[PDB]
From Swiss-Prot, chain A:
Upper taxonomic lineage: Eukaryota, Metazoa, Chordata, Craniata, Vertebrata
Location of this fragment in the whole protein: 2108 to 2979 of 3326
Protein name per Swiss-Prot or TrEMBL: Protein unc-80 homolog
Domain of life: Eukaryota
UniProt gene name: Unc80
Tissue expression as described in the entry: Expressed almost exclusively in the brain. Expressed in hippocampus and ventral tegmental area neurons.
Organism from which the protein derives: Mus musculus
Compartments, record wording: Cell membrane; Cell projection, Dendrite
Residue stretches spanning the membrane: 229-244, 350-370, 637-656, 682-702
Modification after translation, per record: Phosphorylated on tyrosine residues.
Swiss-Prot record, chain C:
Species whose genome carries this gene: Rattus norvegicus (Rat)
Cell compartment(s), UniProt: Cell membrane
Family under the similarity heading: Belongs to the NALCN family.
Top-rank taxon: Eukaryota
Function of the protein: Voltage-gated ion channel responsible for the resting Na(+) permeability that controls neuronal excitability. NALCN channel functions as a multi-protein complex, which consists at least of NALCN, NALF1, UNC79 and UNC80. NALCN is the voltage-sensing, pore-forming subunit of the NALCN channel complex. NALCN channel complex is constitutively active and conducts monovalent cations but is blocked by physiological concentrations of extracellular divalent cations.
Record protein name field: Sodium leak channel NALCN
Record note on domains: Contains 24 transmembrane helices (TM) that form four homologous functional repeats connected by intracellular linkers. Each of the four internal repeats contains five hydrophobic transmembrane segments (S1, S2, S3, S5, S6) and one positively charged transmembrane segment (S4). S4 segments represent the voltage-sensor. S4 transmembrane segments lack some of the charged residues (K and R) found at every third position in the S4s of the NaV, CaV, and KV channels.
Expression sites (tissue/organ): Predominantly expressed in the brain, moderately in the heart and weakly in the pancreas.
Length: 762, 275, 53
């Protein structure tokens, strides 16, 4: 209800107006105001009216100055312009006055749109006045960071009224006029003061095709004036705005694709350009028929900026730009070659992929100082240094992995559809490139054990799990990259397994991801199995899974599963060079057999036996060895050890049922001896109940002993009495066909293993 | 496709959305569901939604209905990319008329996230109209009635204007003006209305066409005017347009309210910008 | 006119014509995807977002 009001001069003050703007004189007598109580609607109406009048006054002031400047003769033009520029600079509130708006008054349905019209007029007038000032200053005027003070107004006018066509084309015309006039400034800088705003507006108003067309036309004219410097400045000004709000990675590619093709002038921007000629390159060196700006040229530019100074901050900006551009470029190439006939497009896409491969091999060759490890460097500064270390390496790994993954199968398909076998399968990312990727990943891995963020890095994970498997690893030339990666992984996991328990705090999700990448590489190319570093890595992983005190914290389910899968794959590859008996020998001793059963043997049998009706991955001698190991844990005992042994016996009997073959009589004899000796004591009746439930091939052999003999013996305790009664009930007058494709049995085994594992540590 | 088909003949948007989703998953696999059956079951679905809404009104879902319609338009577009290849059926086609009727009913049907879904629905309808159009702007200018018994395109134009009277978001109005440009231009809908349905064109001209095109002309959103002005010129070439425009200009510029003249100056300037 | 020359390139990559001065001064310094367009445009047009910018 209450409004500040002036009675001497009939003024009611809008809240967002600065006091000194209206009362500017520092006279002895201070202004006197009244806290006038008004009906809020009446007060807001008065404020709207007076604000409109004030804005019209400001419009008149700007117009008066514009006319005064235009009346000045050809001489005295530079003096007048310099006076204006210095006056604006020394004015403490120049950009604020020329850029502000009444956002609290635009929303009113009454007298709100009139203020908006006046605001559009005022912004256009300010743009025209600043262009008049700019054109009249020396073209080689020594500028600095102060030019932003004058260019922000332009940007301000494009934030408030981007969709206004008159304002948009006025902005484009004046920016082109300043780029032409201050050519030297805008050939090295200047676009950095302007391009981020245009990119933000282009990305924000994606739904506005007219605004996007105007921005694309303006960028095309910029490329016409300054060709390579403008593209480099565009990438430098889009790098902070890229996201993986913010300028997307697709709108940048849309802008580039608009750059490569000529665009029509729908808003007649060129007619407002003061130097309105067929626009040419303002630099004679770039004078050429390079009106086409290929995306390949942009990729080469980014590669070159990185090659110039790999460790520069601008280098990592251009690496981010490349990481944003290359996926879009590959998808666009695929779409273009899919939309047209394969016969003509195959050659074009093959040539484009070869060009991109050469560009990326140049990028990898010209970056060897990023292969160096992080030289040992308050805490925030160290974290910033580590992030700046990790960023370029991660971006390079991502770029190379994405390109290789997309263009491997794509190149194979193209050569199949090329119509001519003369096209040789050019090995994109040659040996030196693979070595570069491996050494970059090696530096990241060397940093990893001390940084939780480095091992969680998406670039390193993508390289390990999606680039190592893809590589051939058949030729001896490429193998040393894999050997280096394997040696680094072996060393880091050995250090984790080593004396320092603090190193064990490393998150096991990234470690399991690395092991999964190794497993995928081994499965894809079994030929890499003979590498000694791989054997050492598998040995270290096995020692990690087993509870071993450094010469403890058990690794979680994912890491243990990955290690067990690696062991299974290695045993599958090396039939006799890596026997499972060798894996299980260092743990068959007492005080360690329980951990072997619950951490290696049972997970191994679950991983190998399950997954198919038949499991030929494990050979007969290995099955015999595992059965002997379990029975030796049983026959020649602790309660938990006996329970684990019986669970492992069940798992082997079910998973490896077919593999046992003609080995049921001896198993029946061993089980009968176990029953006679009361080896289990407890849960032996549970084992017999399991045998009766599943009716496994030993059930038919053990039926007489269980029925006529075992049940004849009297019960000792109620705990065994209940199990004996349940077994007797399950023997006769109970069919209950529970088995079903072995899935339920495997689920039961896994659940019992989890329960026993949880019970052991507690 | 009986199990999908049954889901649309008399069930609310909750039931129909499941079928539309598991038909979307089929379309993602390039499984060519025949377009005639798809159109028939979509007409059945829209009619069922409308009948259920009418029953609810008589006895006396919005996001659900709008999402169902978005999926409907999207599936029509995706299946037309697998069957209607190499030929653009004109607006006067057996199935194009059915698609136009579906779009008409969807626009008429009772529909932050709501605004985005509405914009998407209008955009997909515009894409469908582009697919059904000759895809080439004809000559822009040439140098009561019964609401039914009209060609479906005339009803669609009528309802697009009627709905555009109820919206203010620039994206919505841009998509609706784009639909009209596909209908009024890109196809002699209003020309054939003049030739065959003079009363309907007279009613549209006198009541909705130029008034709404004048309303949608704004300097802040010149994207809207980029589509409004060609449609406005096409309307002026048609009968009864010159008189309505004359009355609009005379009433606005001669108004005593200085705000009305202030707005009319902007309107005429923006009209001139895109002439 | 000194132009940017870089060594250790694969000999198949021709460095673009960039001036050394510019390089020195440069180094020294549900269908939710479809609705994202509308969401971005509506957010941009909102007076609060323009005021914040």
């Amino acid at each position: 209800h209450y409004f500040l009001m002036d009675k001497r001069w009939n003024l009611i003050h809008y809240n967002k107006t600065y006091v000194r703007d209206i009362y500017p004189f520092r006279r002895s007598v201070s202004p006197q105001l009244n806290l006038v109580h008004m009906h809020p609607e009446k007060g807001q109406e008065l404020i709207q009216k007076q604000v409109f009048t004030r804005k019209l006054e400001e419009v008149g002031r700007v117009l008066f100055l514009i006319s005064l400047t235009q009346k000045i003769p050809t001489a005295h033009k530079q003096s007048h312009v310099s006076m204006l520029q210095e006056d604006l600079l020394r004015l403490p509130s120049f950009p604020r006055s020329a850029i502000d708006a009444e956002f609290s008054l635009f929303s009113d349905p009454q007298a709100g749109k009139e203020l908006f019209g006046l605001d559009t007029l005022q912004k256009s007038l300010w743009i025209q006045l600043l262009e008049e000032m700019f054109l009249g200053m020396p073209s080689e005027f020594p500028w600095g960071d102060e030019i932003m003070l004058f260019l922000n107004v332009f940007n301000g006018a494009l934030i408030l009224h981007p969709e206004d066509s008159a304002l948009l084309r006025q902005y484009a015309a004046t920016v082109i006029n300043t780029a032409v006039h201050f050519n030297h400034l805008f050939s090295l800088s200047g676009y950095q003061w302007i391009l981020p705003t245009m990119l933000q507006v282009y990305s924000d108003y994606e739904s506005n095709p007219q605004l996007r067309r105007a921005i694309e036309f303006a960028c095309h004219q910029f490329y016409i004036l300054h060709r390579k410097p403008f593209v480099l400045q565009l990438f430098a000004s889009v790098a902070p705005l890229l996201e993986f709000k913010g300028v997307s990675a697709q709108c940048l590619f849309d802008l580039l694709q608009s750059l490569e093709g000529e665009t029509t002038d729908i808003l007649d921007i060129l007619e407002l350009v003061k130097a309105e000629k067929p626009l040419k390159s303002l630099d004679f060196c770039y004078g050429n028929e390079d009106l086409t700006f290929s995306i390949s040229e942009a990729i080469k530019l980014c590669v070159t900026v990185v090659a110039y100074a790999p460790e520069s901050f601008r280098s990592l900006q251009m690496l981010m730009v490349l990481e944003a551009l290359v996926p879009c470029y590959l998808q666009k190439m695929k779409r273009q070659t899919s939309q047209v006939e394969t016969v003509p497009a195959a050659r074009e896409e093959i040539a484009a992929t070869a060009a991109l491969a050469t560009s990326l091999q140049a990028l990898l060759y010209s970056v060897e100082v990023l292969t160096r490890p992080m030289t040992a460097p308050e805490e925030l500064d160290e974290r910033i240094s580590r992030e700046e270390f990790r960023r370029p390496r991660e971006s390079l790994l991502n770029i190379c992995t994405e390109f290789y993954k997309h263009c491997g199968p794509r190149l194979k398909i193209l050569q199949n559809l090329a119509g001519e076998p003369r096209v040789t399968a050019l090995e994109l990312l040659d040996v030196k490139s693979h070595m570069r990727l491996a050494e970059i990943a090696h530096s990241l891995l060397k940093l990893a054990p001390y940084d939780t963020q480095t091992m969680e890095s998406r670039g390193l994970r993508r390289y390990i799990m999606e680039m190592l498997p893809i590589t051939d690893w058949s030729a001896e030339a490429v193998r040393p990259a894999l050997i280096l990666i394997l040696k680094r992984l072996d060393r880091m996991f050995n250090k984790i397994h080593k004396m320092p328990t603090l190193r064990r705090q490393v998150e096991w999700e990234p470690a399991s991801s690395l092991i999964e990448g190794v497993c995928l590489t081994l499965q894809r190319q079994p030929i890499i199995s003979f590498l000694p570093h791989l054997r050492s890595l598998i040995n270290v992983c096995v020692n990690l899974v087993m509870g071993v005190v450094g010469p403890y914290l058990s690794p979680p389910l994912p890491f243990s599963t990955a290690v067990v899968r690696l062991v299974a794959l290695q045993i599958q590859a090396l039939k006799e060079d890596f026997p499972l008996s060798h894996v299980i020998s260092p743990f068959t001793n007492q005080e360690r057999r329980e951990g072997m059963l619950l951490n290696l043997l049972i997970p191994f049998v679950l991983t190998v036996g399950s997954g198919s009706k038949d499991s030929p991955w494990l050979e007969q001698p290995e099955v015999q060895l595992l059965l002997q190991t379990v029975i030796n844990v049983l026959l020649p005992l602790a309660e938990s050890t006996s329970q684990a042994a019986y669970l492992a016996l069940k798992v082997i009997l079910v998973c490896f049922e077919r593999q046992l073959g003609s080995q049921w009589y001896w198993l029946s004899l061993q089980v009968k001896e176990m029953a006679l000796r009361k080896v289990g004591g407890l849960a032996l009746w549970d084992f017999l109940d399991f045998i009766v439930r599943t009716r496994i091939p030993i059930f038919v052999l053990l039926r007489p002993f269980i029925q006529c003999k075992l049940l004849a013996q009297p019960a000792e305790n109620h705990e065994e009495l209940s199990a004996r009664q349940h077994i007797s009930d399950q023997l006769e007058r109970r069919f209950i066909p529970r088995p079903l494709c072995k899935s339920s049995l495997i689920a039961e085994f896994n659940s019992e293993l989890k329960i026993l594992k949880e019970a052991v540590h507690s | 496709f009986g199990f999908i088909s049954c889901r649309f003949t008399g069930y609310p948007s909750t039931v129909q959305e499941q079928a539309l989703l598991w038909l979307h998953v089929l379309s993602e696999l390039d499984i060519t569901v025949p377009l005639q059956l798809l159109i028939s079951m979509f007409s059945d679905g829209v009619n069922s939604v409308k009948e259920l809404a009418n029953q609810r009104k008589s006895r006396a879902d919005d996001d659900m209905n709008l999402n169902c319609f978005i999926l409907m338009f999207d599936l029509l577009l995706k299946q037309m990319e697998l069957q209607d290849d190499g030929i653009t059926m004109g607006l006067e086609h057996s199935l194009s008329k059915d698609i136009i009727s579906i779009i008409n009913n969807v626009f008429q049907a009772p529909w932050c996230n709501l605004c985005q879904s509405s914009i998407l629905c209008y955009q997909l309808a515009c894409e469908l109209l582009e697919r059904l159009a000759p895809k080439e702007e004809s000559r822009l200018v040439e140098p009561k009635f019964c609401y039914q018994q009209l060609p479906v395109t005339l009803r669609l134009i009528y309802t697009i204007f009627q709905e555009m009277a109820k919206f203010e978001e620039p994206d919505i109005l841009f998509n609706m003006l784009n639909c009209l440009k596909i209908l009024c231009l890109h196809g002699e809908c209003l020309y054939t209305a003049r030739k065959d349905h003079p009363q309907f064109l007279a009613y549209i001209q006198d009541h909705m066409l130029i008034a709404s095109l004048w309303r949608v002309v704004k300097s802040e959103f010149s994207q809207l005017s980029s589509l409004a002005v060609p449609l406005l010129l096409h309307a002026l070439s048609l009968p009864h347009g010159a008189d309505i425009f004359w009355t609009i200009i005379n009433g606005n510029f001669n108004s005593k309210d200085w705000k009305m003249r202030f707005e009319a100056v902007e309107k005429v300037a923006v009209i001139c910008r895109f002439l | 006119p000194q132009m940017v020359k870089i060594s250790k390139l694969p000999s198949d990559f021709t460095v673009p014509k960039i001036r050394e001065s510019f390089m020195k001064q440069f180094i020294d310094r549900y269908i939710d995807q479809k609705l994202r367009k509308s969401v971005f445009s509506i957010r941009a047009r909102n007076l609060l977002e323009k005021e914040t910018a």
